[PDB]
């Protein structure tokens, strides 16, 4: 299947309470593998998955050096934007950044990303051609001009198509037991009478990986999207995910409903019925 590597950075100012807090996390598909917190004691990039713990001191010293450089810069970025938007020094603001690469089933480069958001709003982003930038406001355009003059897109492109994919492939092979695997969902249904003529049927999908999944309810074979309560896919905390979908059924019509489950770990789509 396809794969991806992504780094997420969050910088938050706190006027009158020291310098901004900076948090960095790295992911391969839906598995986190590293982190850095500017408020933590170690002041080092740290492992968050067993397969990356085997990397030597050269790796950890190198990622620590680079991550602190990211921190210092994104700490300063908050000051730069406050100026661009002429905002007061009293308020707390947020800068977010994300970059990474996607690889196809053949493990070759598919797409690359590098974008920012200020206080939850898109600020600047590299376009799909990996050569131009998207800037929504005047401020963003100032950054856009600086980056065009410094030929940032070109340097970035070399990372996205080369370095990024090379490391992703390495991680996929070193942690193949967990990254190249799939945990099919374990399923079941629950039935609960809400009254004397209506009951709730809930379809469960548990302990699955990756997170991508499709859960649906049908009545006589027709979709019941508007009558189905579907919760967001959630982390179990052990590396797997969970999700459920429910529909309220008139007592006596249970047999008309079917739950359908689609997941990469299933040899074939599942069709469940309460009976």
């Amino acid at each position: 299947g396809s794969h991806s590597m992504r780094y997420f950075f969050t910088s938050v100012s706190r006027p009158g309470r020291g310098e901004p807090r900076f948090i960095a996390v790295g992911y391969v598909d839906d598995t986190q593998f590293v982190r850095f917190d500017s408020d933590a004691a170690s002041q080092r990039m740290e492992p968050r998955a067993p397969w990356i713990e085997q990397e030597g001191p050269e790796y950890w010293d190198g990622e620590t050096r680079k991550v602190k450089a990211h921190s210092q810069t994104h700490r300063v970025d908050l000051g730069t934007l406050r100026g661009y938007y002429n905002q007061s020094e009293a308020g707390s603001h947020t800068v977010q950044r994300m970059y990474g690469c996607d690889v196809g089933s053949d493990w070759r480069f598919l797409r690359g990303y590098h974008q920012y958001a200020y206080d939850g709003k898109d600020y600047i982003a590299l376009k799909e051609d990996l050569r131009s930038w998207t800037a929504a406001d005047m401020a963003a355009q100032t950054t856009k001009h600086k980056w065009e003059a410094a030929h940032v897109a070109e340097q970035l492109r070399a990372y996205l198509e080369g370095t990024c994919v090379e490391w992703l492939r390495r991680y996929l092979e070193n942690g193949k037991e967990t990254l190249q695997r799939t945990d099919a969902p374990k399923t079941h249904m629950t039935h609960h009478a809400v009254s004397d003529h209506e009951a709730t049927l809930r379809c469960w999908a548990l302990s699955f990986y990756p997170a991508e999944i499709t859960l649906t309810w049908q009545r006589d074979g027709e979709d019941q999207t508007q009558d189905t309560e579907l919760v967001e896919t959630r982390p179990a905390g052990d590396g797997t995910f969970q999700k459920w979908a429910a529909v309220v059924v008139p007592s006596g019509q249970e047999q008309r409903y079917t739950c359908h489950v689609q997941h990469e770990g299933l040899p074939k789509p599942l069709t469940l019925r309460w009976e």
Binding site: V67, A69, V152
Partner: peptide
């Protein structure tokens, strides 16, 4: 691994 060059806004 991280990108070694860090652009500035």
């Amino acid at each position: 691994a991280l990108w070694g060059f860090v652009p500035v806004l």
